[model samples]
Target: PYSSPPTNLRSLRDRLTQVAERQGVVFGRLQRHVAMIVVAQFAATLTDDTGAPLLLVKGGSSLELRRGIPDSRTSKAFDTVARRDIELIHEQLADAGETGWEGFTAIFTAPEEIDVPGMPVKPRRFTAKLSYRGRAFATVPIEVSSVEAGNADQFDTLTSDALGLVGVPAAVAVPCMTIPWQIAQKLHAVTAVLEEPKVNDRAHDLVDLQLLEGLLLDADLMPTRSACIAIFEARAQHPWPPRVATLPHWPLIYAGALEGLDHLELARTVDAAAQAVQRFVARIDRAT
Candidate 1:
């Protein structure tokens, strides 16, 4: 007896199956499409060889890389760092999914879902991230102190542009300073860079360090997450623009506090965790 499965059950099952398949297709497609978008963006953001490496490590005995060209050993080392960082950025974009995208929108767009004048599609998650800096400090949870949903003007500045919205007095109020009060609306919203994977406070510390770096580097002017790391010591006797070891990653830009945290702590944490996944990458000089 060749019976086609039960009609009602079959209909229900078939419908559910179709929905699942569609979802899978969409999910897969989203990553590919987003990755493509990021690739185009990276290509455009790419500057001259003078630019720093895309990824930078600030403080602690300091090993930084800048520039796309890997001419020298140090330069080549930086290239590795940049490539790795870009990969992470791409991964974040691809993983953005619906929730992540929405986060971006809420922060970047006003009236919800409309494109900005120049950069279309508001990005929220790219706003700010906190990482486990160390055990000595406390890692505050992420929260929205003030959200100007759909208000693009709030985040018009480059840092604000990246994070989405700040609040009243938006331009003057620095997110880094207000981080302790801000709760993580979404875990993915901010990156908690750590050297090890465990249920601890390192992630929180990272966020603080990220903010501290921003403050110290720029002499108390709150910096954007992207441009947080400080290039010069606040007490440096040289030029006010303490020539930071520019790499494509830690650009010597942004406005923020100068009396920041000790960079060594940040480095120790990142170096420990940055290459945790790939043991050899921690120190191996691969490309030259």
Candidate 2:
């Protein structure tokens, strides 16, 4: 009832799915496979759309690139924040049903997919369903947010070697945000939750913070203290806390196998991250 996927893509998907189904698969392994192929195809799709660049924002994709670690994490959906005209990209995707990128089809868009209380803007999410011959596989959510003035130049384009899949068939150079920006964004989100401490699935944010910190330590990629403070202030500025607790966690499932850690350790790790961010922010303010 549907056209077949490109041979390379089909084989790659099968291999990734196989890894996912194997017993005792390590954390992030399955997710790494899925993300690489999905992102590769997505990047290929966007390449012809505008020729302008699309940055892989916050998600497993960014984590892998920044960490220099294989299978560092997993992301359920791809999140790309672009400064381009999002509607045009969305329409191009929708129109490419079986022609351009096979097996990927744009399903719909939820204008209000993101509703963060006290936030300056709500992000629009474009959802696409991945299928093979009429059988559904995964729902890929691409979030497109306008690049704000504060962090416009916080990203760079890099050639990603993970795009060597059947659909894409080669490594693609793509734009991705800087590690500082990624960390600042995650830290701000984590702190935002702290301002309200909503019982949500925010634990992932904490995990990402921890992982990002590790990356900083491993790669010696720490930005200057002043820069860190400025980045954090721009990414996580006050209202101190948002008025509403929007991210309520349900289904209580752990995304990064973080459930293995005890409550005390988890709390301590979060506290440590908060202290680190605040320390940098305060010190940087004093220096200036």
Candidate 3:
């Protein structure tokens, strides 16, 4: 008797499952509902060629998709990356399980649950994600750093495309940054961690890069130069292909900051992760 099994599992945030789990129906419904809500927020403003509102996903959420990590899985709690003023929406969700802008407001009024606001840094640009509840979740908020690039890149399908849905939600579309663009964004994030003393959480990019390296090695792939340069320049306004030694030296602070492993811990280790980052950057640079 396979029917729609609803989980009273305290919303999806606490569980944060991986794609390997494959809890189909639940994730399916949550994604449907999430796409519905995301569209609800932006549909009225659909640009030129979209069947639905355009969501320019970036950062961790984009990485999760590229790596095949489970975000909206039935049991896992997930967030989203939306372009166009994430600072506005992420702020609202921090206040309520909802957010809004000039024209429309997106919320989880179906239930009354809410989560908190963003990171220690400023300019929340690349949207990280949503923390889903019964209908799905809340947002992980957007990074303000990439807003300009996001605005420029939002409509360029070569760099992104509609997020692939479970059953194709009524012609709705959730566009996302492509792997090359996603890599470019991650590179900028590592640089952000190196440069900004307050931006501790960006270490997630370091971790993502580590895994990304191994994956790229497996696939014999290299990140696109234009994508990296575009995002790096847009976010940091620094020289394209940053020098490893020139990057702010690591006291390698933020021991408890990363979402990755122990030794990569910037708190304890010296420049091992930094070294790995050094090699990663060269690889991306060589790809050009």
Candidate 4:
């Protein structure tokens, strides 16, 4: 929890490139440079429209960056920096790669073999993609409005030991959305199954939530209702933990997901999706 930002960000960048290389990603100097710049501190003296070429990594190529705590004052500046830098990074890659909040997530939350506290990691899913909201000002745009929590306090500060792995000067802490927040997002994504039939065989979310069950069952940090409700109710307008039928696609999806599990393992995850929802809801019910 006492993690500090990297004093030598270039070294952090250099090492992360190494990590990404080993992990088979196309992260090189350009991507690394953008990574360093975006996560750094930004000052208030910046102009509203610097009007230089700000590159955005649009379309199918991208990464993640949720907000960390204790840095709210600077988050807006960082967002500005991200908007400009991503545009530059995209130009550098010549439309070959993308970098965004999700790439930020992969970097910060990557599981390092080395020791660091309070940071968590999940395997990169193949299905991941990236996009952001922007407005059309004469065919120009800016990132999603400041009103939205593109990545906010719901994400926790995580120390990336990738720096440690490469023997950087210090533990470089960044942010990833908290597991509960992620679960809420995952839950919100799959609710479409209620109206559509079978979700095109896409229910990996349920399996992902099931896998996360182990981490949450101890209940050290349960989700807050408002935080999750914000996601569930934001645009989807689905009932939080909808009392609707057993999602019509559950059997087909669960059969596919649960196919490989041993009986005990199956039961363990079987109750998880239900229990996880119940657990978070119960926490809110604790309040008044």
Across residues 1-288, which tens digit of lDDT does each residue of candidate 4 receive?
114433344544555667567755445432432333333211111112643222222110111232111110111112221222333332332232234321221122111122211112111111111112121101111121111233233334434343344443333444334555555555555443433332324344454544444445334343434445666566455667543124444666655555433332333333455555455445543533
The true-versus-predicted C-alpha distance at residue 253 of model 4, in Å, is 4.5
Worst 10 residues of 4 by lDDT: 133-142
* TM-score-best of 1 and 2: 2
Q: What is the lDDT of candidate 3?
A: 0.42
Regions of model 2 farther than 4 Å from truth: 1-14, 17-36, 43-51, 68-73, 95-98, 102-111, 132-135, 150-154, 157-168, 193-203, 217-236, 239-257, 260-269, 276-288
TM-score of each: 0.17, 0.64, 0.50, 0.41
lDDT (10s digit) by residue, model 3, range 58-128 = 45544444443332112122233344454344444434323432222344322222322232224432232
RMSD each, Å: 20.8, 6.6, 9.1, 13.9
lDDT digits (tens) for residues 103-170 of candidate 1: 12111111122221211223212222211111111111111111212111111111211111111111
lDDT of model 4, residue 252: 62
Per-model lDDT: 0.22, 0.50, 0.42, 0.35
TM-score of 4: 0.41
| Best-performing candidate as measured by lDDT | 2
Model 1, position 33, has a per-residue lDDT of: 25
**What is the model-wide C-alpha lDDT for candidate 1?**
0.22
When 2 and 3 are scored with TM-score, the better candidate is 2
Candidate 3 similarity to native, TM-score: 0.50
